[PDB]
Amino acid sequence: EQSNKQHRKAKEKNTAKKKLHTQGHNAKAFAVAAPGKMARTMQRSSDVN
Amino acid sequence: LCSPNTPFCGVQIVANSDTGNGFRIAATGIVEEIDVNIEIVKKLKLVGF
Amino acid sequence: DIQGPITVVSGKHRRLTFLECPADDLNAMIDIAKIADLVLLLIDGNFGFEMETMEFLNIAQHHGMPRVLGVATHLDLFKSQSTLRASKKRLKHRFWTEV
Amino acid sequence: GKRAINYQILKNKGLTPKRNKDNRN
Amino acid sequence: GKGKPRGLNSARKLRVHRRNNRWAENNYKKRLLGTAFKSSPFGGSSHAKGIVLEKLGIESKQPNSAIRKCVRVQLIKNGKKVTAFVPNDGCLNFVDENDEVLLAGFIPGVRFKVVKVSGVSLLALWKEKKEKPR
RNA sequence: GGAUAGUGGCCUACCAUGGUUUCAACGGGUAACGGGGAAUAAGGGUUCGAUUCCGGAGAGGGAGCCUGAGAAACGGCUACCA
RNA sequence: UUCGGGUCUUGUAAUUGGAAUGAGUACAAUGUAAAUACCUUAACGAGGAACAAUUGGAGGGCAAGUCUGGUGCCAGCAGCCG
Ligand SMILES: [Mg+2]
Ligand SMILES: [Mg+2]
Ligand SMILES: [Mg+2]
Ligand SMILES: [Mg+2]
Ligand SMILES: [Mg+2]
Ligand SMILES: [Mg+2]
Ligand SMILES: [Mg+2]
Ligand SMILES: [Mg+2]
Ligand SMILES: [Mg+2]
Ligand SMILES: [Mg+2]
Ligand SMILES: [Mg+2]
């Protein structure tokens, strides 16, 4: 009837700042200057398309 | 008979003499199925005391 | 004088055939509606919309909408520009409901 | 000779629920 | 000592540290990389076009049942099949197979509703102020 | 020295080996024209700014020119690509 | 929450009278390069003042009506169809 305390394993899952480089390139480099204009234009173009 | 999904419209009067003023288009519909027989039935009630 | 179909040259490689549907016959309004690639819908501006105008549109809507162009006529009969412009507005917007 | 459009055609109000006169003003 | 520099001439590190840590946010990452619309049901659009494939609940004996108002629709953009809700069985009528339908976000798993059929609003047909062109 | 309205590796001849950089040079991305401004916020901040005003560039894409005080002009000209 | 409690001119699906007025139509003038419109104004323009305001939401009730299930008369669903 003895239940011992779980050992919280050290995170082997990639951290949020490490996942960015798991793909082919460094994703941080390829970003637009004005994200605000990004979302608005994409929404309008999607409806037109 | 005709292929399903063939739309159609119905009119009750085609002669000018009986035109009147009311709208002459009476019904609209879409043909759903073609068959050589149908089994339309109606409610018949017997009444006793 | 015009009677029956009239085929005319309209461009270097484009031709048109004009048909004047009998206004007094409904049976005509049906079968032209099933073959007309383009419709020039004549509307009396002074009088406004009529039955036969509306019915043909309903015939077209059920048997396949062709290209429909509204043509307003007898606008000179209006005596004031204000009512002329204002009348044009209702006729257009009502035409925008059907087409 | 000319068959003018009636009130139902012109306004095209269609099917609407009954609304009390007070809403107008 | 809060684990951070505080010197009057340490503005550079605070900025570089802040920029690096800002990428931790999922919201910041999605906004900059433009991947926020992957999660959207329509892929960033406000409405979805589709074809009506079948009316699943047409047979269902129970009127105005939740099944009766479901229609299978295939999105034109990608070709994935989904379901849409219709406002009521009367509105289920105006829809027939092979009609174009515009869809909008809304039985579980049905997240779409039909707002137009054949380029006209279903409510307009339901109030019967317009007629469906074929 | 040539050239230009004129300074200047702007170009030419001869010389030296220099110049920038962890205070991020160089390279890559940018749904990057910049600003006066607009929105939000209690304050710090965050976003937007093609768009009535200023400044820069362009006239389908390159290259080169006559005229004229002023143009590498295109509702001027010549060649090449589509 | 049942138990009940607090309060007074309230309701009518009833009749009925003459006063005001602009949306609109229109002599004219004003306006304008010339026009339209506005501001003005002779004359018409209201009782369903039909001179017919909309967009959403919530909740009823009904049948010799219809479907489903069952420790009888019920319940669920719903009912443009009797
Ligand atoms: Mg910007
Ligand atoms: Mg006016
Ligand atoms: Mg301490
Ligand atoms: Mg020199
Ligand atoms: Mg040299
Ligand atoms: Mg750009
Ligand atoms: Mg700007
Ligand atoms: Mg230029
Ligand atoms: Mg061009
Ligand atoms: Mg040029
Ligand atoms: Mg020019």
Q: Which of C93, C96, C75 is nearest to C84 (CA)?
A: C75
Please tell me what DSSP assigns to residue E43: T
Distance of CA C38 to the CA centre of its chain: 10
- Go through C27-45 and write b for each residue having 16 or more CB atoms within 10 A of its CB, e for each that does not: eebbebbeebeebebbbbb
Collapsed DSSP state (helix, strand, coil) of residue C39: strand
CB A42 within 8 A of CB E34: yes
Reading the block at residue D8, the tokens are 């139902």
Q: Which of A16, E36, C63 is nearest to B28 (CA)?
A: C63
Reading the block at residue E134, the tokens are 């074929």
Contacts of D5 (CB under 8 A, 6+ apart): C48, C49, C50, C51, C54
CB E88 within 8 A of CB E63: no
The CA distances from residue E88 to C87, D17, E67, E85, E123, in Å, are 38, 17, 11, 9, 10
Probe site for chain C from B12, B19, B25, B30 (most C CB atoms < 10 A)? B25
CB-based contact, E79 to chain C, within 8 Å: no
Closest nt to A42 (CA→C1')? F31
Give me the amino acid identity at E97.
E
Whether residue B28 and residue E98 make contact (CB cut-off 8 A), yes or no, is: no
Structure method: cryo-EM
Instruction: For residues E47 and C6, give the distance between their C-alpha atoms in angstroms, rounded to a whole number.
Output: 46
Reading the block at residue C98, the tokens are 């059907």
Residue E46 half-sphere exposure toward CB, CA atoms < 13 A: 9
Reading the block at residue E97, the tokens are 């197979």
Distance of CA B10 to the CA centre of its chain: 8
Contacts of E74 (CB under 8 A, 6+ apart): E50, E51, E53, E80, E81, E82
- Between positions 61 and 120 of E, the ones with CB within 8 A of B are 96-98
CB A20 within 8 A of CB A28: yes
- D3 interaction partners in chain B (CB closer than 8 Å): 19, 21
Probe site for chain E from A28, A37, A45 (most E CB atoms < 10 A)? A28
Instruction: For residues E48 and E35, give the distance between their C-alpha atoms in angstroms, rounded to a whole number.
Output: 19
Q: Which of E69, E115, E117 is nearest to E89 (CA)?
A: E69
Reading the block at residue A22, the tokens are 């798991």
CB E55 within 8 A of CB E71: yes
Q: Which of E119, E109, E103 is nearest to E42 (CA)?
A: E103
Measured in Å, residue C99 CA sits from the centre of ligand 6 at: 39
Reading the block at residue B47, the tokens are 């009444």
Which position has the token pair 């009367």?
E90
- Which residues are found with C-beta within 5 Å of the ion, ligand 1? A 34
What chain B residue is nearest to E131 in terms of C-alpha separation? B28
Distance of CA D20 to the CA centre of its chain: 15
Reading the block at residue E108, the tokens are 């579980």
Q: Shortest Cα distance from A40 to chain E (angstroms)?
A: 10
CB D12 within 8 A of CB D5: no
**To one decimal place, what's the resolution in Å?**
4.2
**A30 CB neighbours strand F below 7 A:** yes
Give me the amino acid identity at C61.
Q
Q: Where are the domains of chain E?
A: 1-134
